[PDB]
Paper text:
An essential protein complex in oxygenic photosynthesis is Photosystem II (PSII), a multi-subunit pigment–protein complex embedded in thylakoid membranes. PSII is instrumental in catalyzing light-induced water-splitting reactions, which result in the generation of electrons, protons, and molecular oxygen. The core of PSII is associated with peripheral light-harvesting antennae to enhance the absorption cross-section of PSII. The membrane-embedded LHCs of cryptophytes contain Chl a/c2 and alloxanthins, thereby designated alloxanthin Chl a/c-binding proteins (ACPs).
Here, we report the structure of a PSII–ACPII supercomplex from the cryptophyte [name] by cryo-electron microscopy (cryo-EM). The structure of PSII–ACPII was resolved by cryo-EM single-particle analysis, achieving an overall resolution of 2.53 Å. The structure reveals that PSII–ACPII consists of a PSII dimer and twelve ACPII monomers forming four linear trimers, as well as a Chl a-binding Psb-γ subunit that is identified to connect ACPIIs with the PSII core. Each PSII monomer comprises a PSII core complex, 6 ACPIIs, and a Chl a-binding polypeptide, denoted as Psb-γ. We also identified 209 chlorophylls a (Chl a), 14 chlorophylls c (Chl c), 4 pheophytin, 48 alloxanthin (Alx), 24 α-carotene (α-Car), 8 crocoxanthin (Cro), along with 4 plastoquinones, 4 hemes, 2 Mn4CaO5 clusters, 2 nonheme irons, 2 bicarbonate ions, 2 bound chloride ions, as well as 56 lipid molecules (including 16 distearoylmonogalactosyl diglyceride (LMG), 24 dipalmitoylphosphatidyl glycerol (LHG), 8 digalactosyldiacyl glycerol (DGDG), and 8 sulfoquinovosyldiacyl glycerol (SQDG)). From the N-terminus to the C-terminus, Psb-γ encompasses the N-terminal region, the transmembrane domain, the ACPIIs-binding motif and the core-binding motif, establishing a connection between the entire core and ACPII. Psb-γ has a single transmembrane (TM) α-helix (A82-A108) that extends into the interface between the core, [name], and [name]. The unoccupied area on the stromal surface of PSII enables Psb-γ to bind to PSII, which is important for stabilizing the PSII–ACPII association. [name]/2/3 and [name]/5/6 antennae form two belts of linear trimers on one side of the PSII core, and the [name]/2/3 assemblies are positioned on the outer side of [name]/5/6. The EET from ACPIIs to the PSII core predominantly occurs through the mediation of [name]/4/5/6, which are directly associated with the PSII core.
Author numbering:
A (entry chain e): 9 to 83
B (entry chain v): 27 to 163
C (entry chain a): 11 to 344
D (entry chain c): 23 to 473
E (entry chain w): 43 to 91
F (entry chain d): 10 to 351
The structure:
């Protein structure tokens, strides 16, 4: 049925007064929990550098990349 | 790394005593530096006289040495040439010359302390950016 | 039945091969003068001291340039934006030393394109058709005035206008990026959207009109001959193209109305080029593109680079290397 | 719905105001409501500037654009362009904001409940776009009003407090302009001057006597012209040379106002008399010449003979000769040798910058001004990062001159585009082919083929 | 250049063309104008030439 | 219709809101996996371990500075499969070595393939000529030449265009500084095609909107068109007269006009693709040897070309240290090419 016919329907809004904010808040707790930094490996504001690692970290080998990544990301 | 106390400890006096700046102090110092002197001293340089920057090498080799909070704070009220023989209060922003430099009028002793803390804290953050100029932007 | 009336009828005549009109009265002499001086200066002209430091730059073919490197060099920085006609020079040789031909060509050409705008309106009026094709042409003229006139005015020197050459155009680009960061300036981004979208919509519209051409041609004959000039019927099925494009993306996106379609075609590139011309006009007065340099710092407060910083490195290289002998002081305020 | 839909008017909602062309009272309400919008913004914005104004920084460093106008008119500013009081700014703001209520009520009244057309209930105010005499009378009344405004500026400069002269003896100060220049050869000498470098046309006002005297001239001109148009009708040469419709009048106003926008943009960019550098900040030429002056003073202080110092290319590193021979500051400031500011004229002789004054008698305040104007050049980004494009994010600053110049150049170009649109449409609609080409009588098919 | 002469007229000779050529053009235009029906009209433009 | 293949074909080609088609089995997954991947990489994934940069909204970047940066240079031209010998199935390390760029690019290539196949399929089923699928070949050529063949000619995927805004600006200036790509005649032909296509779009829109026939009595003339009318809505003869007597030449044939509108941008894109393919192998129109020799022997010979060469040297030297961190370029201030003052 046509788009405007759905949007003005009350049932649409009984569904989406609850469904949309739920995931809008789910993203909030996804990042506020710090879970994104762990899934995607992104350094936090206090993880770009560390002791003996005041320089930029770079992977310099194709095949041992995981190995040096743990070595650099031991933290 | 966090803004630990190792970064926030800066020399206080000429003998060698240190002082640990608080996060409020460094925040206020950064804001005051950017508002009162950023126009000429953005990046630890001197736009009007690039021969004399704010990098720790220049401050240490100044007469008197300006690599400490008390010396910097005294410079902000009794500025002098690089050899400390002529007063340049009429050509430099100073709290004693705030009528002709209307940005120094509102600064208190704690504001001068925070500004000096910001100056001495900067070189700790980067190895060459503070006073390095374009080459390290 | 008066000589002035006959002259006005001839000028405003729709029987001349090329319409003159009253705007053409100003356009044709100005454009012809600009063309003549440009051709003469491009084939043969002495080097020009563009930067006002007695370091002439060659731009003419006879002085060791090709079509790619040739240019009519901008005026000397010593002149500034002072008016520099031939009669204000002690001699014609020193008129050519300080790049007077650039001033002549630019002034005559800007007046000529203004006359072209007006003449487009005029011959729209003589044929009884709607105006505003001229409004479409204002966008290129806006950009040309922005680069040739407004940028010298803001920066204060005709040396800063774009050179009338190909390599000089690239030089002006690189210096503009170094000094203003035009790429990060959102009006130039709107212009990039304008030209890319103009190409996209041109390709799309041509593809859909050519794709739904009504069969009016044999197999041993070009399809273009299926259309006869001045015919009354449409040469292609608007319904077929509209339905194909609706199935391609979704029905609502397609322009079922042809007049709205062509208004959008005329609107997107014209507005984009208006915006980028205005962006150059505003960076003439040093309202630069965005400066996100050192915008990300860690908890300690040390700068973590971004792509803005790496772009800044290229801008800084261009800044330091441009006009190596012209600057005596650290800031590039001029 | 009648007169407010496409069916009964032929105009869509997005050309909605085009449905006001022949509705005189509703159009009057539109104009009055929009004037209410203008005065509302003036009051609200200057109150915002007063609220955000800190007494430490100067006006130009705080992003303030409106309070400089009042300071130039001579309110709440002392010697040296130091803003001592900001209560008159508050008074102006509240007056504009309160007057906006009255103008908004009038506009909403005439738009919604007032008579649609004034031509039957108020024939004095009603009009037809094609009735040349009545439209000229309206134009003349407005010209008299503009002349009254010019004379209001004259009264302010001459009697009520006076205006801020940045060229005043000593430092710049608020002073009474007792002797404006009323010589036609000066006032209209400015109007016929060239716009190119060194001339500047009317942007090159270097004193307030010329400004006030030429405002007297503008007031006299406008009042005389208004009385001329009230008691006259357009002549035959004019009656055949114009399209006498509302859209044509709109296009004429649009082109005039676009020209004014360009001129005002360059006024804010180049002039430093009606736009003193102590309120609007340095001009670009001022900042560049200030950089050259600062480094001249520095190197002279360090033992260099600035007059005899040779730059990389053989030209003067600090001092050289302009193309006309005047001794001028060197480097890339050579293009800006036409700068004249109250802080640099003191060192200027008949033949340029006097070398004796430049060597022995540069005062400390000149060095301070040069440093301030160097560090506060008009350069900056859209997000307000002061300095060159390749600078770092520590200084938050764009000069008010850059904002005003860019905004008014933008609006001038936009209003030229609007003029082109509306003038073309006026011509097409008067001739009667603004809706399309008549399929019955197409002019092109009647024309003989070319080639 | 940069002297401030009105319309660039530094020599008085320059005025002779600047004033006369419009006057000859004005004289030629007057022959056209005098032939027109110069009474008023109530229209957006004059259709009478 | 009876057979299983016939049933699948019937369902895939159903006339619904979103046409699926057989090509949809290649387009919709990969395209989706591309776009969300970008939205993932530009939102959470970093370039700290590949470029030394922050490139996500999480790290603090905005829409301009956020990007899906290319892989590390040490990766070479690895396919960067999540199960490959580099990540070895670890999602976090995969994102950290910039394998998400490989994901986005390799899925985008097949998304472009699927969309061109979609254009062909819908053109066939609707029953029109397939000129729109051939015009998308231009964009396909741009993507293939710039994102696949260029890094495959260079040392690694690292030098591909990083998927962003500021990243693309950095790619533009990098290619200019290192290849002098503005001097490349194929780039010149491409920008000619692009600007000429924008010109054709603008002139055609204005001309059609301004030679419309009076098909109504409303000042707003959009409503005076019917989709199914068998009458041209604007005068080709009047437009031809206008442009012939204004510009000397003018289109007289609509079909030629609309093929030209197709040909100009497509030709531009293919020409510029030839130039970028040249740049993949460092076969660059960098210099005019005659002028280089003359300037070497004549220190007073200066052209705008030589100024551009100096600018390119500046770009290279001042950009290499931070743009190629894997090389560990330490250029002292002594060796950096500079000018007087600034
Ligand atoms: C400066 C802005 C401006 C102004 C002054 C006007 C004014 C006008 N427009 Mg509008 N218009 C504008 C912008 C503006 N327009 C824009 C941007 C668009 C594009 C969407 C339109 C589209 C448009 C259309 C399509 C039409 C008009 C029409 C009109 C006129 C009649 C209004 C009417 O009866 O509506 C009735 C409206 C209402 C009953 C809604 C309530 C509006 C209230 C009064 C606004 C509240 C204002 C303020 C808070 C009150 C302060 C009170 C004071 C005492 C303090 C009126 C003169 C009509 C016209 O031409 O008629 C002949 C018409 O058809 N306009
Ligand atoms: C562009 C401005 C404008 C114009 C042209 C008109 C025109 C009109 N209005 Mg008015 N009107 C306006 C603004 C305007 N209005 C505003 C701003 C408001 C809101 C306050 C109103 C509110 C309004 C109402 C409520 C009504 C009208 C009506 C009318 C009509 C009759 C006017 C009349 O009888 O005057 C008579 C004039 C006067 C009474 C004014 C006398 C002067 C006083 C004492 C002020 C003196 C000021 C002084 C000289 C200024 C010194 C300047 C110094 C600071 C330099 C007429 C069509 C009437 C109408 O259409 O009825 C259907 C009507 O009822 N108008
Ligand atoms: C808002 C202002 C305004 C407007 C809209 C009009 C409108 C009109 N006036 Mg004018 N007029 C005005 C103010 C105005 N007047 C004033 C203040 C005076 C002085 C008393 C006059 C004196 C006047 C007279 C004596 C006559 C008109 C007439 C006319 C009509 C013809 C205009 C024309 O063709 O000009 C043509 C303009 C020119 C040929 C050029 C103008 C010359 C100046 C000096 C140019 C100088 C160069 C300039 C500085 C260059 C740069 C400008 C830059 C902004 C682009 C028209 C109805 C005529 C009419 O029919 O009256 C009944 C007529 O004879 N007006
Ligand atoms: C978004 C809309 C917008 C905004 C917010 C502004 C804002 C501004 N414009 Mg404007 N402007 C706009 C659109 C806008 N403009 C457009 C579209 C154009 C056309 C292109 C212009 C063209 C324009 C010009 C030409 C100029 C401005 C200027 C200005 C500034 C001053 C306003 C002023 O006082 O005007 C003038 C105000 C009036 C005409 C109202 C009447 C004033 C009376 C008569 C003054 C009485 C004074 C007297 C001393 C009082 C005391 C009397 C007694 C006690 C003695 C201000 C920043 C000025 C500026 O600084 O430019 C750089 C300027 O010169 N604007
Ligand atoms: C003095 C100022 C002035 C006045 C009184 C009018 C009056 C009118 N214009 Mg407008 N116009 C102006 C300035 C003015 N114009 C300028 C400066 C331009 C050039 C940009 C135009 C361009 C224009 C067009 C193209 C058209 C009109 C039309 C009209 C009529 C209806 C407009 C309407 O209802 O809009 C209602 C308002 C809206 C729908 C809101 C739109 C807001 C836009 C989208 C925001 C701005 C976008 C973008 C930043 C602009 C870039 C411009 C570029 C040149 C830089 C009405 C007679 C229309 C008409 O029917 O004429 C008879 C018409 O077709 N005008
Ligand atoms: C339209 C569908 C489609 C397409 C064309 C692709 C294409 C691609 N994906 Mg995949 N992908 C898809 C859907 C799709 N994907 C979906 C829905 C998901 C989400 C679950 C993913 C998730 C995903 C990830 C996480 C990754 C890819 C990657 C890839 C690339 C590597 C493919 C590869 O080598 O896989 C392996 C080969 C195949 C899958 C083909 C199978 C062929 C037959 C059916 C096997 C038969 C078995 C045989 C009999 C076994 C006998 C044993 C032995 C002797 C042979 C390639 C661009 C990689 C990439 O982009 O790296 C940068 C990558 O890491 N994709
Ligand atoms: C992801 C994904 C598929 C994104 C698509 C984005 C999207 C909705 C794009 C729409 C672009 C756009 C506004 C289309 C109009 C452009 C246009 C001038 C096309 C040419 C054209 C359109 C028609 O609609 C008809 C009818 C004919 C003839 C015709 O040429
Ligand atoms: C338009 C908005 C831009 C503002 C332009 C400034 C307007 C000032 C006009 C005076 C110009 C001036 O004094 O000339 C002065 C300058 C030239 O004057 C210079 O003066 C110098 C000292 O003053 C020296 O004498 C130089 O030799 C001399 O060249 O004018 C020019 O630049 C040439 C004028 C070109 C005019 C183009 C014609 C425009 C086409 C239609 C004209 C409109 C006609 C409307 C009819 C009514
Ligand atoms: C007294 C004081 C002391 C300290 C500071 C403080 C600010 C608080 C100050 C108080 C000031 C006060 C209360 C000021 C009051 C001002 C008021 C109420 C101003 C209102 C002005 C009204 C205006 C513009 C109306 C204009 C309306 C227009 C065009 C409407 C447009 C429209 C119309 C007409 C028809 C179609 C719809 C559309 C387009 C919306
Ligand atoms: C990535 C990856 C790795 C391995 C396997 C796996 C299948 C998971 C694979 C694929 C993952 C996929 C496809 C994930 C899906 C993620 C997607 C689709 C993310 C997209 C998110 C969209 C976003 C933010 C949109 C934001 C939009 C904005 C602001 C719009 C701005 C606007 C607003 C807010 C108001 C008006 C103006 C304007 C400009 C329109
Ligand atoms: C007020 C002030 C402040 C600072 C000091 C200063 C001395 C400058 C002082 C004085 C300023 C003065 C006196 C300014 C006066 C400005 C003047 C008189 C400007 C003149 C503007 C005139 C213009 C555009 C005329 C253009 C008219 C045109 C096309 C008319 C129409 C037409 C004609 C003529 C022929 C072709 C067809 C068409 C288009 C119908
Ligand atoms: O000349 Mn052309 O250019 Ca615009 O900046 Mn300053 O001066 Mn030079 O420098 Mn960078
Ligand atoms: Cl310099
Ligand atoms: Fe078409």
């Amino acid at each position: 049925r046509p788009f405007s016919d759905i949007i003005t329907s009350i049932r649409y809004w009984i569904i989406h007064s609850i469904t949309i904010p739920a995931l809008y808040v789910a993203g909030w707790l996804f990042v506020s929990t710090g879970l994104a930094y762990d899934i995607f490996g992104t350094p936090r504001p206090n993880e770009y550098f560390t002791q003996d690692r005041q320089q930029v970290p770079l992977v310099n080998d194709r095949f041992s990349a995981k190995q040096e990544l743990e070595d650099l990301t031991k933290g | 790394t966090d803004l630990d106390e190792n970064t926030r400890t800066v020399p206080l006096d000429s003998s060698g005593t240190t002082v640990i700046l608080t996060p409020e102090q460094v925040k206020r110092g950064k804001r005051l530096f950017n508002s009162s002197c950023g126009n000429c001293h953005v990046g630890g340089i001197t736009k009007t006289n690039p021969n004399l920057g704010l990098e720790p090498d220049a401050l240490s080799l100044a007469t008197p040495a300006r690599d400490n909070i008390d010396a910097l704070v005294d410079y902000m009220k009794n500025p002098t040439t690089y050899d400390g023989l002529e007063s340049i209060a009429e050509l430099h922003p100073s709290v004693k010359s705030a009528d002709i430099f209307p940005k120094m009028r509102s600064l208190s002793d704690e504001d001068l302390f925070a500004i000096g803390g910001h100056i001495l804290l900067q070189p700790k953050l980067s190895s060459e950016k503070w006073g390095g100029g374009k080459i390290y932007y | 039945a008066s000589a002035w009336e006959r002259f006005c009828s001839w000028i405003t005549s729709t029987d001349n091969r090329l319409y003159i009109g009253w705007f053409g009265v100003l356009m044709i002499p100005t454009l012809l003068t600009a063309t003549t001086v440009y051709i003469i200066a491009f084939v043969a002209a002495p080097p020009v001291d563009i930067d006002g430091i007695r370091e002439p730059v060659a731009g003419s073919l006879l002085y060791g340039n090709n079509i790619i490197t040739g240019a009519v060099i901008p005026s000397s920085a010593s002149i500034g934006i002072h008016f520099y006609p031939i009669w204000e020079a002690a001699s014609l040789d020193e008129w050519l030393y300080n790049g007077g031909p650039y001033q002549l060509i630019v002034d005559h050409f800007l007046l000529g394109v203004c006359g072209w705008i007006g003449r487009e309106w005029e011959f729209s009026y003589r044929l009884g058709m709607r105006p505003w094709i001229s409004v479409a042409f204002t966008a290129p003229v806006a950009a040309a005035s922005a680069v040739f006139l407004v940028y010298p005015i803001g920066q204060g020197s005709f040396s800063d206008g774009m050179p009338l050459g190909i390599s000089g155009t690239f030089n002006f680009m690189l210096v503009f990026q170094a000094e203003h960061n035009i790429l990060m300036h959102p009006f130039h981004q709107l212009g990039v959207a304008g030209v890319f979208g103009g190409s996209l919509f041109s390709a799309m519209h041509g593809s859909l009109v050519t794709s739904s051409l009504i069969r009016e041609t044999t197999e041993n004959e070009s399809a273009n001959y299926g259309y006869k000039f001045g015919q009354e019927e449409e040469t292609y099925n608007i319904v077929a193209a509209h339905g194909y494009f609706g199935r391609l993306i979704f029905q609502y996106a397609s322009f079922n109305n042809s007049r709205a379609l062509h208004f959008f075609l005329g609107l997107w590139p014209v507005v984009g080029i208006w915006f980028t011309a205005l962006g150059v006009m505003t960076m003439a007065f040093n309202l630069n593109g965005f400066n996100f340099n050192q915008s990300v710092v860690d908890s300690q407060g040390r700068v973590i680079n971004t792509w803005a910083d790496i772009l800044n490195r290229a801008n800084l290289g261009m800044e330091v290397m441009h006009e190596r002998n012209a600057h005596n002081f650290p800031l590039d305020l001029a | 719905v009648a007169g407010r839909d496409i069916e009964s008017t032929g105009f869509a909602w997005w050309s909605g105001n085009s449905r006001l062309i022949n509705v005189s009272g509703k159009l009057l309400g539109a104009h009055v409501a929009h004037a209410g919008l203008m005065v509302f913004w003036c009051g609200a914005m200057t109150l915002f500037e007063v609220a955000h104004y800190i007494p430490e920084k100067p006006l130009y460093e705080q992003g303030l654009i409106l309070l400089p106008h009042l300071a130039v008119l001579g309110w709440g500013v002392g010697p040296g362009g130091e803003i001592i009081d900001i209560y008159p700014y508050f008074v102006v703001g509240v007056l504009h904001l309160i007057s906006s209520a009255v103008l908004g009520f009038g506009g909403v009244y005439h738009s919604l409940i007032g008579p649609d057309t004034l031509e039957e209930s108020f024939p004095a105010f009603g009009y037809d776009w094609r009735d040349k005499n009545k439209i000229t009378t309206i134009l003349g009344i407005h010209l008299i009003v503009l002349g009254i405004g010019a004379f209001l500026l004259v009264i302010k400069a001459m009697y009520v407090g006076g205006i801020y002269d940045t060229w005043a003896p000593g430092g710049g100060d608020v002073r009474i302009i007792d002797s404006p220049t009323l010589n036609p050869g000066v006032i209209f000498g400015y109007v016929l001057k060239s716009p190119w470098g060194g001339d500047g046309w009317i942007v090159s006002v270097n004193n307030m006597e010329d400004l006030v005297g030429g405002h007297i001239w503008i007031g006299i001109i406008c009042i005389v012209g208004g009385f001329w148009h009230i008691f006259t009708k357009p002549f035959a040469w004019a009656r055949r040379a114009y399209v006498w419709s509302g859209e044509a009048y709109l296009s004429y106003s649009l082109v005039a106002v676009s020209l004014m926008g360009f001129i005002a943009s360059q006024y804010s960019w180049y002039n430093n008399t009606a736009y003193p550098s102590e309120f609007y900040g340095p001009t670009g030429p001022e900042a560049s010449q200030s950089q050259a002056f600062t480094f001249l003073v520095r190197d002279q202080r360090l033992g260099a003979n600035v007059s005899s110092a040779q730059g990389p290319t053989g030209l003067g590193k600090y001092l050289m000769r302009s193309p006309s021979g005047e001794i001028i500051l060197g480097g890339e400031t050579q293009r800006f040798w036409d700068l004249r500011a109250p802080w640099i004229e003191p060192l200027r002789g008949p033949n340029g910058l006097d070398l004796n004054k430049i060597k022995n008698d540069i005062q400390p305040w000149q060095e301070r001004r040069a440093a301030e104007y160097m560090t506060h050049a008009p350069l900056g980004s859209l997000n307000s990062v002061g300095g060159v494009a390749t600078e770092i994010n520590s200084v938050n600053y764009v000069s008010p001159r850059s904002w005003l110049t860019c905004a008014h150049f933008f609006l001038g170009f936009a209003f030229y585009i609007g003029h082109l649109w509306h003038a073309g449409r006026a011509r097409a609609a008067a001739a009667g082919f603004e809706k399309g080409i008549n399929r019955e009588n197409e002019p092109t098919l009647s024309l003989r083929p070319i080639d | 250049e940069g002297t401030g002469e009105a319309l660039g007229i530094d020599d008085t000779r320059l005025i002779v063309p600047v004033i006369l050529i419009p006057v000859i053009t004005f004289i030629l235009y007057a022959g056209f104008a005098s032939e027109q029906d110069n009474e008023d009209f109530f229209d957006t433009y004059d259709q009478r030439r | 219709g009876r057979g299983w293949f016939d049933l699948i074909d019937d369902w895939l080609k159903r006339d619904r809101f979103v046409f699926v088609g057989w090509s949809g089995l290649l387009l919709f997954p990969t395209s989706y996996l591309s776009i969300g991947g970008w939205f993932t990489g530009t939102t959470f994934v970093t370039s700290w371990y590949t470029h030394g940069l922050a490139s996500s909204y999480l790290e603090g970047c905005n829409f301009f500075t956020a990007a899906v940066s290319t892989p590390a240079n040490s990766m070479g031209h690895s396919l960067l499969l999540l199960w490959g010998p580099e990540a070895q199935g670890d999602f976090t390390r995969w994102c950290q070595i910039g394998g998400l760029w490989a994901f986005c690019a390799l899925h985008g290539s097949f998304a472009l393939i699927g969309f061109c196949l979609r254009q062909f399929e819908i053109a066939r089923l609707v029953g029109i000529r397939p000129y729109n699928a051939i015009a998308f070949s231009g964009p396909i050529a741009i993507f293939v030449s710039v994102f696949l063949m260029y890094p495959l000619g260079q040392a690694s995927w690292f030098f591909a265009p990083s998927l962003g805004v500021a990243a693309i600006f950095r790619f533009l200036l990098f290619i200019q500084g290192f290849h002098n790509f503005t001097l490349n005649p194929f780039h010149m032909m491409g920008v000619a095609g692009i600007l000429g296509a924008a010109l054709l779009c603008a002139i055609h829109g204005a001309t059609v909107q301004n030679t419309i026939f009076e098909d109504g009595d409303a000042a707003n003339t959009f409503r005076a068109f019917t989709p199914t009318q068998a009458e041209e809505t604007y005068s080709m003869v009047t437009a031809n007269r206008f442009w012939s007597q204004i510009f000397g030449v003018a289109f007289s044939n609509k079909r030629w006009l609309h093929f030209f509108m197709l040909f100009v941008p497509l030709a531009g894109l293919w020409t510029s693709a030839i130039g970028i393919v040249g740049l993949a192998l460092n076969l660059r129109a960098y210099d005019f040897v005659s002028q280089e020799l003359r300037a070497a022997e004549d220190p007073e010979f200066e052209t705008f070309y030589t100024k551009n060469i100096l600018l390119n040297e500046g770009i290279r030297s001042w950009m290499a240290a931070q743009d190629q961190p894997h090389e560990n370029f330490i250029f002292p201030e002594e060796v950096l090419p500079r000018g007087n003052a600034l």
